[PDB]
Amino acid sequence: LDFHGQTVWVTGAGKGIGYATALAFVEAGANVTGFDLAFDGEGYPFATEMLDVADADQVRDVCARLLNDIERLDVLVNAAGILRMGATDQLSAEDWQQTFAVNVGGAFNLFQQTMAQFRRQRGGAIVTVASDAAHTPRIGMSAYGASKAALKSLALTVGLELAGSGVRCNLVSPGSTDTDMQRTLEDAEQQRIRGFGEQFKLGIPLGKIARPQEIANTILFLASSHASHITLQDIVVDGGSTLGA
Ligand SMILES: NC(=O)c1ccc[n+]([C@@H]2O[C@H](COP(=O)([O-])OP(=O)(O)OC[C@H]3O[C@@H](n4cnc5c(N)ncnc54)[C@H](O)[C@@H]3O)[C@@H](O)[C@H]2O)c1
């Protein structure tokens, strides 16, 4: 998959799946800009922009400055997200509000500031990282899953709005992936693969959890010309755990 001479923006690029994705686009030849609240690495193989995607004002300013200098935004990837766990009636009011401000509002803010660019240029691809928790209820993750189901719906309607401009808009829904967000919760991995029948959580038929590169490669496929007739789709990347749900 050859992205030479394409401008690619990736949110959540300071680490994890967002980092892996931005690096994969660099490895594919793209001119990559990463966006994140914090870049704690000593060096990044791409341009980096400090941005709190939940802050509508900050997103308008950064997008306006950058969009001045580029003719074309070839790929937007929304991968910024936070995970706040809890029984629904124990989750704090801050955890609720921040979950939705970031996981839905972030993409909303980026969409509000980039859709005109996508309409003007007449093409491009958007890939949004949802989650398997948007596909199946998960004990402890009611808010997280709800925010990711709202993100998915928003991205699909934005895809429908932009389809007349030739823009393709798709999603990837990872299952458990080896990143910082997952390590916070070391037999945990084998037990995830096995499942928790007591929590109605299916094991992983493929017998392993995901690598961030395995999510990245799916994003690149959907962003690429190989997927030139794919839009409004959501690929679950989870070793079969949701059984196709
Ligand atoms: N790891 C998994 O198992 C898993 C499963 C399903 C979905 N996801 C999703 O994948 C995406 C990336 O997750 P990860 O596992 O790499 O998490 P991570 O914590 O390793 O990295 C996520 C990045 O997003 C950034 N971010 C958070 N809030 C932000 C904000 N307001 N503005 C800008 N950047 C912000 C963080 O600073 C961080 O750099 C998220 O949407 C997450 O929900 C991960």
Task: Tell me the Cα Rg of the chain.
Answer: 17
Report the greatest alpha carbon distance in the chain: 54
Best of 39, 44, 49, 82 for a ligand 1 pocket test (most atoms within 8 Å of beta carbon): 82
User: Which ranges in 163-211 belong to alpha helices (H)?
Assistant: 180-183, 188-194
Q: Which helix (H) or strand (E) holds 132?
A: none
| SS3 call for 154 | helix
Task: Return left, alpha or beta for 244; rule: phi > 0 is left, psi -120 to 50 is alpha, else beta.
Answer: left
Strands 7-11 and 31-36: what pairing? Answer: parallel
Length of the chain: 245
Could you give the CA distance from residue 178 to residue 185 in angstroms, rounded to a whole number? 11
Domain membership of residue 234 as a residue range: 1-245
Within 8 A by CB and 6+ apart from 23, the residues are: 45, 46, 216
Could you give the CA distance from residue 82 to residue 100 in angstroms, rounded to a whole number? 9
Which amino acid makes up residue 11?
T
Q: Token pair 């709800």 is at which residue?
A: 146
Q: What are 110's two structure tokens?
A: 């980026």
Task: Return left, alpha or beta for 167; rule: phi > 0 is left, psi -120 to 50 is alpha, else beta.
Answer: beta
Find the catalytic residue in 3, 19, 118, 144.
144
Number of structural domains (the chain) is: 1
DSSP code at position 213: H
Q: Which helix (H) or strand (E) holds 78?
A: strand 75-78
- The resolution in Å comes to 1.9
Could you give the CA distance from residue 191 to residue 183 in angstroms, rounded to a whole number? 13
**What's the gap in Å between 18 CA and the centre of ligand 1?**
7
Could you give the CA distance from residue 204 to residue 221 in angstroms, rounded to a whole number? 23
Could you give the CA distance from residue 187 to residue 52 in angstroms, rounded to a whole number? 34
Strands 201-202 and 195-196: what pairing? Answer: antiparallel
Which amino acid makes up residue 53?
V
